[PDB]
Design a protein around this ligand. Structure first.
Ligand SMILES: O=C(O)Cc1noc2ccccc12
Length: 167
């Protein structure tokens, strides 16, 4: 038994809810929140801009130190940093950005990072401002992630569409 409430169960391990991921993290304080990061950890908008704003820019300060030491992530890769006031940890995961012409096949690699964590609160990777088809992102999530994932869909009509079209 964990602290997540109100989710629709899609599979043995994947759950979904229409939610603002910033408000859900603040309420639950999960072990792991996933950020929809870019390779530079520049948290300007979408999930990253919203998560970073909720940390009063502390996420960006920590991220800039990480990049100054390590250089950029890979598309499909991740790093674990502080969750600040939102979570114990933040798993910054880079899905491909369709708008940058990045290979959609890297979405599966991105979701494989979730398997290193028993339970996660997450967005649909490459959805929203990343430009991928969110229905595809949910299919890759279900077919890739084996650990327990609680998905936060920001858009209502998208949430209702994801549910109603789920195989
Ligand atoms: O609903 C999401 O979580 C991201 C998203 N994916 O696609 C959308 C379209 C409009 C607004 C938001 C979105």
């Amino acid at each position: 038994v964990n602290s997540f409430s109100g989710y629709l169960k899609l599979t043995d391990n994947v759950y979904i809810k229409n939610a603002d991921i910033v408000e859900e993290a603040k309420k639950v304080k999960p072990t792991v929140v996933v950020n929809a990061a870019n390779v530079y950890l520049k948290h300007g908008g979408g999930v990253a801009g919203a998560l970073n704003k909720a940390t009063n820019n502390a996420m960006q300060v920590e991220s800039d130190d990480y990049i100054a030491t390590n250089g950029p992530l890979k598309v499909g890769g991740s790093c674990v940093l502080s969750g600040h006031n939102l979570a114990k940890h933040c798993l910054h995961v880079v899905g491909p950005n369709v708008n940058k012409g990045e290979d959609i096949q890297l979405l599966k690699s991105a979701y494989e990072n979730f398997n290193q964590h028993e339970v996660l609160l997450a967005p649909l990777l490459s959805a929203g401002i990343f430009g991928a088809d969110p229905i595809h992102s949910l299919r890759v999530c279900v077919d890739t992630v084996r650990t327990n994932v609680y998905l936060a869909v920001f858009d209502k009509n998208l949430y209702d569409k994801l549910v109603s079209s789920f195989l």
